């Protein structure tokens, strides 16, 4: 039986916006949690349901996850590189809401640094990476069906749907377009082949 209803967390971010647009265009019934609805567009495809709130508030997350078939996580810290627990605490809330509502599939973005040599993270990105690691741990230990998406640099190239997905962080490039990353998150809703795996999408544009 196929996924029809999804929640997207981080839908207003760079990857989230295009994932949201793609998901709605593809026929999903999409719910988003946003702190600030002005960051959603008017033009283009529109989510079916908007919850205004914060991933750090369990009740807001619970309302967003209720009734879904799957969850996509595209949380991040925008240009804030300071020490942080937002993503991992958000993930804890997401896991608890999934378990409370019977939702068993989550596709969540961290970064290719979690596949590459862990001693080879630029210093300025280490604090954010440490919270990606905490988030990955929360999701992997949840025992839910979890696809770990670990992209390299997120670019602005057009959608292709032609990227390569490896399991080890090696591949044709160190870039994935935001649009292709979103397309891949959606693909993960219609296969089990990546459940319990780490995935590395990349493409030469």
Ligand X SMILES: NC(=O)c1ccc[n+]([C@@H]2O[C@H](COP(=O)([O-])OP(=O)(O)OC[C@H]3O[C@@H](n4cnc5c(N)ncnc54)[C@H](OP(=O)(O)O)[C@@H]3O)[C@@H](O)[C@H]2O)c1
Nearer to ligand X, 15 or 192 (CB): 15
**Count of all residues that appear for the chain in the document:** 205
Report, in Å, the least distance between residue 1 CB and ligand X. Answer: 29
Which parts are annotated binding residues for NADP(+)?
Answer: 10, 12-15, 35, 38-39, 54-55, 75-76, 78, 87, 109, 132, 153-154
- From 97, 107, 188, 189, the catalytic residue: 188
Is 100 catalytic? The answer is no
Indicate which single residue of 56, 66, 81, 133 sits in contact with ligand X (rule: CB under 6 A). Answer: 56
HEC string for the chain = CCCCEEEEECCCCHHHHHHHHHHHHHCCEEEEEECCHHHCCCCCCCCCEEEECCCCCHHHHHHHHCCCCEEEECCCCCCCCCCCCHHHHHHHHHHHHHHHHCCCEEEEECCHHHCCCCCCCCHHHHHHHHHHHHHHHHHHHCCCEEEEECCCEEECCCCCCCCEEECCCCCCCCEEEHHHHHHHHHHHHHCCCCCCCEEEEECCC
Give the bridge partners for 145, in sequence order: 105
- From 17, 23, 91, 109, the catalytic residue: 109
How many residues of this chain interact with ligand X, rule: CB under 6 A? 28
Interface with ligand X includes 188 (CB under 6 A)?
no
Is 188 catalytic? The answer is yes
Interface with ligand X includes 12 (CB under 6 A)?
yes
Interface with ligand X includes 10 (CB under 6 A)?
yes
Indicate which single residue of 58, 86, 96, 127 sits in contact with ligand X (rule: CB under 6 A). Answer: 86
Interface with ligand X includes 130 (CB under 6 A)?
no
Q: Which residues bind ligand X (CB under 6 A)?
A: 10-16, 33-36, 39, 54-56, 74-78, 86-87, 109, 111, 128, 151, 153-154
Q: Which residues are catalytic?
A: 109, 188
């Amino acid at each position: 039986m196929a996924v029809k209803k999804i929640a997207i967390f981080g839908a207003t971010g760079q990857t989230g916006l295009t994932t949201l647009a793609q998901a709605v265009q593809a026929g999903y019934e999409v719910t988003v949690l946003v702190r600030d609805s002005s960051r959603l567009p008017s033009e283009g495809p529109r989510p079916a349901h908007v919850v205004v709130g914060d991933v750090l508030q369990a009740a807001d997350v619970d309302k967003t996850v209720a009734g879904q078939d799957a969850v996509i996580v595209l949380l991040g810290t925008r240009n804030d590189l300071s020490p942080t627990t937002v993503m991992s605490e958000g993930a804890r809330n997401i896991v608890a809401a999934m378990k409370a509502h019977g939702v068993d599939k989550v596709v969540a973005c961290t970064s290719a640094f979690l596949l590459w040599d862990p001693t080879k993270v630029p210093p300025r990105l280490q604090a954010v990476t440490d919270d990606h690691i905490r988030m990955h741990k929360v999701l992997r230990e949840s025992g839910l069906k979890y696809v770990a998406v670990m992209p390299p640099h997120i670019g602005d190239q057009p959608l292709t749907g032609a990227y390569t997905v490896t399991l080890d962080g090696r591949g044709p490039s160190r870039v994935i377009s935001k649009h292709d990353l979103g397309h891949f998150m959606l693909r993960c809703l219609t296969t089990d082949e990546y459940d319990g795996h780490s995935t590395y999408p990349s493409h030469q544009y």
